[PDB]
Design a protein around this ligand. Structure first.
Ligand SMILES: COc1ccc([C@H](N)c2ccccc2)cc1
Length: 284
């Protein structure tokens, strides 16, 4: 029985190596990684790989790994797939911990924009969780943390993290992580998966997929939101992605909004993440 070496980038930035049989489905590898992480609330997470066009793809746990990675390396990342709107409802602290690590990367990467004050507050909870109570002995007037907090660090930001850290004395890691999440969950881009697209006129937009529905990001005076219930069907054809939008009560017919994606693979990717989000948040 022939086994393939898998390398998985974990949310702490470390690399986990394991083997699976070469005809293994994604679920096999995912189960191994989750056991390694002592993670039980697995439904919110997934593995990603980079395709031949270097796009992030979710590893489908139901399909053979080899038919997804195809010509590429068996190299993956462990990631949050479904960001819970209410992380306080998660059963386990360790689930909230992995969600925090994901969100820290979302912030540093600039995928999750955040005000100065919220960057400093989130950073102050991370420090409290990781180091415990504020200590002046490690932190002088010239202190810069090893913790990456933001896409662009300033001395201002470092000072504000310390000021807020001082206020968190006696806070345990689980408590600090829960505060981190109570703040992060409110950010307008929390758990929004963004896709580049053109509207039916050829104007460049962004489509965002998240718990509440589908968002269209245009000129920035116009953001359209379609709650999952208002979305009757989702489809793709060639480079095109279509959503059918329910009639307003006493309307005879549904409306169709068409979008142009970069290529067929990008349209299929968007369709699959929309279907998955619609199912997940319909049931949650
Ligand atoms: C992490 O976010 C959630 C997790 C579980 C639920 C679940 N359906 C529920 C609803 C109501 C009361 C208790 C459990 C809901 C949200």
């Amino acid at each position: 029985p022939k086994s393939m070496q898998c390398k998985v980038i974990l949310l702490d930035g470390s690399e986990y190596t394991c083997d699976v049989e070469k005809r293994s489905r994604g679920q096999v590898l995912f189960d191994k990684v989750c056991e390694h992480l002592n993670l039980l609330e697995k439904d919110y997470f997934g593995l990603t790989y980079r395709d031949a066009e270097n796009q992030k793809n979710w590893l489908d746990p139901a399909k053979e790994i080899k038919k997804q990675v195809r010509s590429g390396a068996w190299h993956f990342s462990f990631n949050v797939k479904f960001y819970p709107p209410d992380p306080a409802q998660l059963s386990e602290d360790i689930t909230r911990y992995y969600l925090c690590l994901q969100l820290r990367d979302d912030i540093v990467s600039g995928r999750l924009p955040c005000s100065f004050v919220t960057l400093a507050l989130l950073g102050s909870y991370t420090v409290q969780s990781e180091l415990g109570d504020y200590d002046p002995d490690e932190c002088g007037s010239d202190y810069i943390s090893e913790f990456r907090f933001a896409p662009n660090h300033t001395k201002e930001l470092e000072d504000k993290v310390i000021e807020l850290h001082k206020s968190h004395r006696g806070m345990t890691p689980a408590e600090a992580e829960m505060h981190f999440l109570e703040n992060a969950k409110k950010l307008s881009m929390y758990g929004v998966d963004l896709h580049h697209a053109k509207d039916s006129e050829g104007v460049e937009i962004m489509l965002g997929v998240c718990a509440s529905g589908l968002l269209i990001y245009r000129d920035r005076l116009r953001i359209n939101r379609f709650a999952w219930p208002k979305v009757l069907k989702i489809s793709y054809k060639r480079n095109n992605f279509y959503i059918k939008i329910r009639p307003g009560e006493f309307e005879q017919f549904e409306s169709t909004i068409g979008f142009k994606l970069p290529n067929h693979r990008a349209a299929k990717r968007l369709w699959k993440v929309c279907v998955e989000h619609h199912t997940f948040f319909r049931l949650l």
